[PDB]
Design a protein around this ligand. Structure first.
Ligand code: UK2
Ligand code: UK2
Ligand code: UK2
Ligand code: UK2
Lengths: 302, 294, 307
């Protein structure tokens, strides 16, 4: 069998993503019913930069699959040497790293599945959790309208583009000039959207992006590695704040998503986070179920 | 109906008796209770690392069938209320080592799973449950025993021995020098609870009088900048004034030669090693009890 | 009678054979032995961190049904806030075995002298005995019977691997040669213990500065890093003396034609070992890395049942 990896959202076809999302709903209902790692078999969970929430969710999820997560947090060894030995110890490799080329290198030589837990360019597992949450609140994903606001070149904007159009969602990214999606990601999303009937829109007009939306999404304006980049990373993003005024422009039944943690008062307001349209708490919980589903699916296919 | 354990008197006398009985049952049959089978998660969070606390909780949770998710050294990148909401979706209880009591109260008022004070500046209520289990297995009934704590009367063990001790019906004496006495509000709460159980509260600077007739002698680390505590050293002369078959307690680590001597720590009155082991059983019992009530 | 494993010759030749057979059985059936079902605890304590040591022990302990409690070096070093004797006393109430990475051998001795559960040396300044059990399992897999094989170690002859290959190798009946420059020779006490154990097994001990002679006719060639982290500031040029002892293709071609190459990880490609040797058909480094899991599980199962 071909060893499958999940390094970016479009590594799953539309039909494969639907299978993983259906499995996430099944696992939420029956969380110890799938035990492919019974033994326990190991899963490596490796951090080039520590992420407590990522480690938390995978550590518990792997245990609930019957496995034992071995956490290695933040040189002496080539990536090829690491892939070779880990393939003897564990049944999958979950890795939080920086550049995408490193994930590609690991996945090219490892003989077990490699999962991008979180990287600079993509956050594929969080977007599976998002799609699971939208399906819970709204039903069918195909044809929904989703708008993301803020830094249009960060990992969530890229993954909402790719994962969203894979699900058949029309995705809009509202971002200031200078902060737009990577051209390669945008072109890949446009091509994938052709297969599903979705579309890709990029705009600097936050009000137009909010009008008619079914889902509004935002994220922190600045990652830790961007704090020293020299830019004023507040002034450009203020018009893109997800506040009550913006939300009132969307569909009456619109929901709001936000990868945690949120910086209340910056990209999102208290009234929105804590109001009836907020799905952020279900979204955070569903990271557990969606990651378990992804692991089960990759392991069975590999 | 979500019960928390932030300080010793969060359990009533009857509820404390239930937890202590459960701790004895779990010592006998350590994998017989599996409320966390799955595994279900328990968050174990440290604002300041404590290896011994982490060690005992991590193993005990595993023996309840659970998986402890340990977070070393909250409130860093998100509000405490946001943290409580999400944690309540991932785990069945929250074990937290933090400093001020206002942080514990804040987490407990929002979380919809039990919050346990693993160790704090003001109280050490899990360690006192382990002490009470140790006293009961060596002496039987707790009601009416005389317990004396020696040394720093302002620290968390003095407060918890006062509150947890009188909750069990024990007459508690704190022997301590002038600049290091119990917090007045803890003392008042312990005097109130002692009226319900027939116990009493005494605070004195006279170590000889506190040791005379004691059934349980307890001390703890003092931290010469420790001159005022040396008259309260738990040494062979003090122990010789106690009731026959008295026992000596000290939560670890102990600084031998400071607050306690080798002859007392390694002698026949010492229950320090059983006491350390019973932290495992008592914390498991607390978790089992809170989980079934919540 | 509580058994410990602080150094390779803590097992007799017959006992070592039992552990190695158990390691082969556990490789075939990795969750069939559950002496720690419960879970029972095992303490895994690091005075200095070693990721690969923790990785392998943590997973192996879970596969025995247990739960590893890992205590890293950030925690106050054992001996500082508390005597080793007090620590052993309390750990004995919490866990069924103590796995400890520490420095001087006297600390291990003090711990095992009072603990009432088995104490295992995970890695120390003087010995690396669990790694050599993994090596012996790997050699047996590739070669069959260990008795009478010729094994040569190259590089720093006074580090923990050289000492454990001497003691563990002669316990298995292997003729062990250490090839090292003057000033980097095995500890005399270890060499004398190996020489004594060797006359029980038909083995032999050789120490030489001649790398070519040590490679000629060898069945197994082994090396390790020339410097550990604690030696980087010892004042010595730790490259120039070891260059003649590099495991490269020319050295390997002197050995027996079916010789195998071992190196515990990490390895520094280009220094003590070359890419061609690491990645060629004689290399057993990857199987060796994997067998750390099985050999450590076997050692724990054996010590727990014997105690
Ligand atoms: C357990 C383990 C894990 C990774 C590596 B390696 O070097 O990436 C090595 C080991 N090992 O050899 O014990
Ligand atoms: C697993 C976990 C734990 C805590 C938080 B939070 O924001 O305190 C978030 C997550 N999460 O959404 O992955
Ligand atoms: C020991 C080690 C070293 C490096 C890496 B890595 O991914 O750069 C991983 C490990 N590991 O997973 O054990
Ligand atoms: C769990 C544990 C482990 C070790 C020690 B000790 O003092 O080395 C103490 C405890 N304890 O008292 O909880």
């Amino acid at each position: 069998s071909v060893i499958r990896h999940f390094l970016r959202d479009d590594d799953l076809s539309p039909a494969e993503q639907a299978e993983v999302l259906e499995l996430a709903a099944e696992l939420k209902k029956d969380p110890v019913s799938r035990r492919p790692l019974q033994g326990p078999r190991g899963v490596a969970v490796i951090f080039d930069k520590n992420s407590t929430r990522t480690r938390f969710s995978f550590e518990l999820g792997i245990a609930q699959l019957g496995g034992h997560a071995v956490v290695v947090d933040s040189r002496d060894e080539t990536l090829q040497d690491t892939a070779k030995v880990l393939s003897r110890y564990v049944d999958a490799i979950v890795w939080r790293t920086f550049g995408q080329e490193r994930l590609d290198a690991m996945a090219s030589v490892a003989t077990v599945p490699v999962i991008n837990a979180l990287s600079d360019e993509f956050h594929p597992c969080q977007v599976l959790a998002d799609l699971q949450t939208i399906a819970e609140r709204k039903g069918a994903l195909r044809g929904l309208r989703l708008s993301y606001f803020g830094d249009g070149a960060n990992n969530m904007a890229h993954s909402l583009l790719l994962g969203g159009v894979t699900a058949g969602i029309h995705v809009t990214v509202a971002a200031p000039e200078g902060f737009l999606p990577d051209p390669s990601v945008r072109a890949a999303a446009e091509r994938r959207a052709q297969d599903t009937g979705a579309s890709v829109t990029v705009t600097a007009d936050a009000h137009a992006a909010a009008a008619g939306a079914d889902v509004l999404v935002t994220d922190t304006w600045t990652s830790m590695g961007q704090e020293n980049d020299g830019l004023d990373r507040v002034k450009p993003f203020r018009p893109f704040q997800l506040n009550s005024r913006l939300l009132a422009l969307a569909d009456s039944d619109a929901i709001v998503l936000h990868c945690l943690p949120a910086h209340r008062g910056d990209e999102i307001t208290d009234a929105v986070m804590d109001g009836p349209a907020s799905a952020v708490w279900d979204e955070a919980e569903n990271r557990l179920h969606a990651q378990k589903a992804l692991l089960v699916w990759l392991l069975e296919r590999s």
